[PDB]
Amino acid sequence: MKYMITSKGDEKSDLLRLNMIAGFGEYDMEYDDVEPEIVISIGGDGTFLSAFHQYEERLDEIAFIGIHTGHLGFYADWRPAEADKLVKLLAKGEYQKVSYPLLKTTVKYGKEATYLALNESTVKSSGGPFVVDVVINDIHFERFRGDGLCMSTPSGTTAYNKSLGGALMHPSIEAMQLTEMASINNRVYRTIGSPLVFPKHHVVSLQPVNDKDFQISVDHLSILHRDVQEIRYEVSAKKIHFARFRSFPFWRRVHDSFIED
Amino acid sequence: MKYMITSKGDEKSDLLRLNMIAGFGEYDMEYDDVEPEIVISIGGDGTFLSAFHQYEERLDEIAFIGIHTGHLGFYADWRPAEADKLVKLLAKGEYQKVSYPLLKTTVKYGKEATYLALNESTVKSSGGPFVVDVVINDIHFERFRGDGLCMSTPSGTTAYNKSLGGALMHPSIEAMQLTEMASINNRVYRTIGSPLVFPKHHVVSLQPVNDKDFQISVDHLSILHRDVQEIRYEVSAKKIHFARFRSFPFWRRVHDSFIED
Amino acid sequence: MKYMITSKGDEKSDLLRLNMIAGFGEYDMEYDDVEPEIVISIGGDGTFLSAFHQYEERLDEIAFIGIHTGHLGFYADWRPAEADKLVKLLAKGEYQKVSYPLLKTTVKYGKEATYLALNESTVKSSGGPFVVDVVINDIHFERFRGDGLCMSTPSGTTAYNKSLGGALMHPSIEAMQLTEMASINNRVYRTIGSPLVFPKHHVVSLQPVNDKDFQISVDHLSILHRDVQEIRYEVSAKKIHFARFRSFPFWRRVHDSFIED
Amino acid sequence: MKYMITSKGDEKSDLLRLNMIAGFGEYDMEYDDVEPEIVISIGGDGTFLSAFHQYEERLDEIAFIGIHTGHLGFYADWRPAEADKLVKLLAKGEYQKVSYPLLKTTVKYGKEATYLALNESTVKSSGGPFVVDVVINDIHFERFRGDGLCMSTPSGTTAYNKSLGGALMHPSIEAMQLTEMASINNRVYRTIGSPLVFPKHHVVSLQPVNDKDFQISVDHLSILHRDVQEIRYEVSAKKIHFARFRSFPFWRRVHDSFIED
Numbered sequence A, B, C, D: 001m002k003y004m005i006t007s008k009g010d011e012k013s014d015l016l017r018l019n020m021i022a023g024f025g026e027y028d029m030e031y032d033d034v035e036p037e038i039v040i041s042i043g044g045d046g047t048f049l050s051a052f053h054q055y056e057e058r059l060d061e062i063a064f065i066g067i068h069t070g071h072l073g074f075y076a077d078w079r080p081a082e083a084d085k086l087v088k089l090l091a092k093g094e095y096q097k098v099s100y101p102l103l104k105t106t107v108k109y110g111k112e113a114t115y116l117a118l119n120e121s122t123v124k125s126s127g128g129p130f131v132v133d134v135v136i137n138d139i140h141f142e143r144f145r146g147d148g149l150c151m152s153t154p155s156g157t158t159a160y161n162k163s164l165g166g167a168l169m170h171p172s173i174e175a176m177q178l179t180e181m182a183s184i185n186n187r188v189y190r191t192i193g194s195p196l197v198f199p200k201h202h203v204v205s206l207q208p209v210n211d212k213d214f215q216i217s218v219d220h221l222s223i224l225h226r227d228v229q230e231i232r233y234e235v236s237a238k239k240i241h242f243a244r245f246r247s248f249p250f251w252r253r254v255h256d257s258f259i260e261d
């Protein structure tokens, strides 16, 4: 069907893309980067994250595939030498799709702006002190003082979340996970410390105490927001879909990336 | 209906129990500690854990309630001054039940023994070095060397799991969480470090490498097991049921126990 | 002798300052904010840090005293109600001095700039990815990828260092302590993880890998540095001196600020 | 002079020992395992720790050397292929000695018993709950509830201490470091959390609250102590001496064992 291919842009990835397009030319496959049904990302996890954000308005009619030309690749779990086999299997269809949960971030002012994250959304101050009230389903939970906060999807838990001490969650769990960045805890200031895991339909609201300017990141797109009244997190209703051609379990992916390969 | 009441055994809890039995005597309520449908625990979380294990063969036909006579009480979320109101509301019924997930531990030898946990199951060595192979759904994930491992239920995540760096999970999530106790990590020895969160139907198997004697705890019942071939963890099919008379959200309970009250 | 008094600037601190100046007027004491031998700080630890940086060129001929008008005060360990007693005892002299170690930061370009820290010096990137080579006494120790690094004095270990997982060190130990901010650790990227404690005369050098713009903080004075070739840390030869009138041990200060008071 | 050689006891180490004894036979060197001046350990760090405890009454007249026949070896920093060169250089003398600090543990009852540690001393309960009052220089600092406590020497900081979150300290610093094992922290129970670093002459006393039976380990020699009134820690006046023939800096040793080699 309709497909497109993004590339990290180095020689290796560009030529792989050109060879895959040539192999696709031998089947009933049309290159269309406006309304593809298949998005192939060639590069690393950064390249894959860009492909997701490029098509985040047609997530429900798209299956993603990642090919890793360098190292790691939690999302890009295909090797370049298997590109010919991928073309052939993907051309013949008959593949199953798997779906990972997404995170919805809403930023209110004094209008509304919403974002979708595949890894995480983080909040930090505008250079001054970061102080926010953390409100869980309209219940004031804690006043956070520190460097910032990170809300991760399940597939994002192996990324920034992991570096902050968070737990690794299997992506079949529809949840989001909040981790602290360097909170103050003395006799006067008090946070929970532990990462927090939230189910679907729970809403986590960050509300400013004094300064209302914040740096908000969504999958490493980092934007300064001014005059912020509230930042709201919830598990999205939308999901990302992966074309899956082989069994490559999440815990094996974890083993391969952090333990050994 | 049929009910019973356990007590921590100090003067305060015993007299509260005797006064509640007297108040129940004024309704169609029968004291039966063989087949109760309502189990009231008067004491702390330890007392409540004992009540759960006392009736763990009739979990599906029992609703539990906890009254805290001292401090904390994550499970015992009723104050003693509200005992009269509890009797009256519980006598009139018309209460909703809420269900928390449980953890199943299977210990194999060279027969099989199974246990149910409301907080967690932990494994440590018999005094020597603890070394186990961690196998996730029949896939070898890591060789663990250290003091031990802890597998927590969701409601258990605020207990031992929390002290080990684990995340706090809302009990509506059907999952179990594995945390490490003091693992060795150098050039030769390698674990994941992070807590791991597993969905229903995932099986985590611990398999001995050399020594096969282990200390296995289930909710602080600690038993030396000899000639162990495998320890298997999975989210149980059984659930604990709480009689709920008021809204007391999990995250408020967390706030009250760790942040302030 | 010569003395001056800084104030946090709120009503409480200003009037305390004016009353102490009036009490000093009754002794052989001269208000001199150019070459004081005694510097009194009235406010919190921020106020005290400003007093230290205001006089950091005459550290060897100055004894500092802090009065805390609000909460905490690890450096400002005097209560406002004891201001009259402080004036009297300080006017009569006969006090012992205690000295805490300091941290020297050198920033090289492509000239040299040096700074003194009482709490810590931290390094972060200019908004992009932070990557530095960590070189210990001219030996390449690790390539750090993450949010940043923090080098703390001993008295600074209860501040930012503590929030980053660092150890609390008694200030009689002449040392500096390096902590990581959220480092990446996978199969490709590798840091030590643990805080590192360095003796006098050890030199820790941070050397850029790609980007050479960094945000460098010295006691929460945060300055963007461009064209950086090296950041060097070592225990300073200079020391801060406190006028001490009573026994208030460091570990009691720690107990009072973090455990209870 | 007088020397002896301990072996891990496998074929590799025994034959290396026999070949080194043969090479020593060609110089003015006498095998004496009663009053050696040189103790060579052939094996791993466990073997080296046994050699230290075997001669801990003559520490001041002995220089230790370790040869690692397997992996790691923080104390045994010689490779087997350099055994001939070691014999020759050690026979000709003209080597410098380096000294590492030691930890003194005193256990009081209701008599006194003292121990020396090269890595650490740890305390755990006798199977029940571990509760101790932590007293620093006769000042009550905290009541600890949890799995146990670990007091490390500087060279011990890369061992158990590291797995507990402690900082790595250069062995030229005369200090000991206290780390917690899984402490409870809620509204009722409160510890400092952070590792604590103590200078020479500071005394840390553990005092029982209820149960007075404890498992006390000194360099992995673990002994059940009954009727304990106090456990006292201080930096020892004694030191271990290493024969050093080459420059092998501590931070390079750390790099080689944890980062890469």
Ligand SMILES: NCCS(=O)(=O)NC[C@H]1O[C@@H](n2c(C#CCOC[C@H]3O[C@@H](n4cnc5c(N)ncnc54)[C@H](O)[C@@H]3O)nc3c(N)ncnc32)[C@H](O)[C@@H]1O
Pocket: A044, A045, A046, A049, A071, A072, A073, A074, A119, A120, A155, A156, A157, A158, A159, A160, A161, A163, A219, A220, C129, C145, C146, C147, C181, C182, C183, C184
């Ligand atoms: N490009 C500059 C940010 S880089 O320098 O930290 N590199 C990112 C590294 O991660 C890997 N990665 C990614 C990715 C990616 C693209 O970057 C943006 C992402 O970078 C993360 N990030 C930011 N600051 C971090 C930090 N201090 N520590 C750890 N990660 C950090 C954050 O998640 C963000 O979305 N998603 C996952 C995943 N799902 N599972 C496991 N690993 C993952 C990626 O393969 C690379 O190794």
Ligand SMILES: NCCS(=O)(=O)NC[C@H]1O[C@@H](n2c(C#CCOC[C@H]3O[C@@H](n4cnc5c(N)ncnc54)[C@H](O)[C@@H]3O)nc3c(N)ncnc32)[C@H](O)[C@@H]1O
Pocket: B044, B045, B046, B049, B071, B072, B073, B074, B119, B120, B155, B156, B157, B158, B159, B160, B161, B163, B219, B220, D129, D145, D146, D147, D181, D182, D183, D184
């Ligand atoms: N009795 C001797 C073990 S006591 O000394 O550590 N006390 C237990 C403490 O905890 C609280 N608690 C419990 C409970 C209980 C009954 O103990 C058995 C349980 O004690 C836990 N435990 C063992 N070693 C621990 C340690 N080092 N740190 C922390 N907890 C530890 C473990 O979970 C076990 O099931 N379940 C939860 C819960 N669901 N949420 C939040 N808090 C909870 C309880 O209120 C008390 O404060």
Ligand SMILES: NCCS(=O)(=O)NC[C@H]1O[C@@H](n2c(C#CCOC[C@H]3O[C@@H](n4cnc5c(N)ncnc54)[C@H](O)[C@@H]3O)nc3c(N)ncnc32)[C@H](O)[C@@H]1O
Pocket: A129, A145, A146, A147, A181, A182, A183, A184, C044, C045, C046, C049, C071, C072, C073, C074, C119, C120, C155, C156, C157, C158, C159, C160, C161, C163, C219, C220
């Ligand atoms: N003003 C905005 C930064 S504030 O919002 O984090 N507040 C600082 C807090 O700390 C206390 N404090 C200070 C102080 C001070 C003045 O700030 C500048 C300092 O703020 C520290 N800081 C920055 N980001 C932090 C973070 N995420 N977590 C913890 N501390 C952080 C950093 O050390 C810097 O020098 N020195 C020490 C000390 N010696 N012992 C124990 N406590 C200390 C101070 O009493 C206050 O409670």
Ligand SMILES: NCCS(=O)(=O)NC[C@H]1O[C@@H](n2c(C#CCOC[C@H]3O[C@@H](n4cnc5c(N)ncnc54)[C@H](O)[C@@H]3O)nc3c(N)ncnc32)[C@H](O)[C@@H]1O
Pocket: B129, B145, B146, B147, B181, B182, B183, B184, D044, D045, D046, D049, D071, D072, D073, D074, D119, D120, D155, D156, D157, D158, D159, D160, D161, D163, D219, D220
């Ligand atoms: N034999 C059973 C205990 S073994 O299974 O944990 N193995 C010990 C491991 O360590 C290394 N090691 C040693 C050593 C040794 C001999 O064991 C006794 C020591 O084992 C330590 N130990 C106990 N439980 C631990 C745990 N959970 N995590 C980490 N270490 C633990 C404890 O320090 C004790 O003295 N001193 C240091 C050092 N100075 N620098 C760096 N590494 C060091 C050694 O090379 C080996 O890799």
